[PDB]
Amino acid sequence: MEFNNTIPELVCRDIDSSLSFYTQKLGFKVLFEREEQGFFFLYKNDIQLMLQQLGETAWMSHSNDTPFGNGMNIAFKVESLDDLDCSTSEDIFLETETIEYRVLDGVASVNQVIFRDPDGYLIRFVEQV
Amino acid sequence: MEFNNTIPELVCRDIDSSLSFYTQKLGFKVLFEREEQGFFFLYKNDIQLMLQQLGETAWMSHSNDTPFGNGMNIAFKVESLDDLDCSTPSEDIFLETETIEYRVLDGVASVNQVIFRDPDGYLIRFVEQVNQLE
Numbered sequence A: 001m002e003f004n005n006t007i008p009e010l011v012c013r014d015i016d017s018s019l020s021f022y023t024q025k026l027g028f029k030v031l032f033e034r035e036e037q038g039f040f041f042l043y044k045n046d047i048q049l050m051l052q053q054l055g056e057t058a059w060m061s062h063s064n065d066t067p068f069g070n071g072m073n074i075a076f077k078v079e080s081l082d083d084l085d086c087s088t089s090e091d092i093f094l095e096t097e098t099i100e101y102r103v104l105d106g107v108a109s110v111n112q113v114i115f116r117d118p119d120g121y122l123i124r125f126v127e128q129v
Numbered sequence B: 001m002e003f004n005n006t007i008p009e010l011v012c013r014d015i016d017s018s019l020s021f022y023t024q025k026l027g028f029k030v031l032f033e034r035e036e037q038g039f040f041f042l043y044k045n046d047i048q049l050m051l052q053q054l055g056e057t058a059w060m061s062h063s064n065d066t067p068f069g070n071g072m073n074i075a076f077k078v079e080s081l082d083d084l085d086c087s088t089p090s091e092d093i094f095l096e097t098e099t100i101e102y103r104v105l106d107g108v109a110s111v112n113q114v115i116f117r118d119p120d121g122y123l124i125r126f127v128e129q130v131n132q133l134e
């Protein structure tokens, strides 16, 4: 199989809850799993994302009681936000908005939404317009 | 410009310290910046990464005192680990360079990998695929 050049791996306090969030709310599918390690490799179109149940094999930068994901957001580029459940929700960190960003070679106009997953990871979907 | 389909954005407690880490230890370069916002868009080969000074415009899941990046690691695929300053012993190294086989969808991925821990605790995993056997 082909691995994307950038794949986030999210340790999940409750992998069942996280799996339901990513599959049912965000439309990811399970590509493969190592279920005996609580590990799931998810995909949606061209994006990939790994989930890992919190446990002894997890790579934890801070203590287990430290809330997850602070400071970061993952920007996923999508052709459209239509297949996302952006109902406006405790799952929504930033409601759908159109924003102009000044970038290297001009202005990137985007439609974007940010979700906050069950452990606090921020997942930003960006549609370039 | 072409935006990668997956780009992490890391809020940095000390943007100059983080910029020095990513550019000097990990070999990223600045593609462009928004200086007024403390924002930097970095690149290295096919990898892109965003850094932003902790401040008014930062998207923060938890309180500012909550340590950053817990639970996540970003896996960056690279052709080689050679250029990376993986030198030990270092507080920058979370997982020393190792070769590991992973069971994947259609076989086994044999990789060389190293995990860095950046100045705020974000884990950056560099993965060199040695082979995949079906």
Ligand SMILES: C[C@H](c1c[nH]c2ccccc12)[C@@H]1OC(N)=NC1=O
Binding pocket: A075, A076, A077, A101, A102, A103, A108, A110, A126, A127, A128, B003, B004, B007, B009, B041, B050
């Ligand atoms: C807005 C930029 C961006 C990230 N991913 C994208 C996918 C399609 C089009 C644009 C983008 C980038 O993100 C932020 N926070 N500032 C930036 O310049």
Ligand SMILES: C[C@H](c1c[nH]c2ccccc12)[C@@H]1OC(N)=NC1=O
Binding pocket: A003, A004, A007, A009, A041, A050, B075, B076, B077, B102, B103, B104, B109, B111, B127, B128, B129
């Ligand atoms: C090891 C896998 C992987 C992530 N990025 C890569 C780049 C090249 C070859 C393999 C990979 C993936 O990561 C983890 N933790 N388990 C997995 O199956």
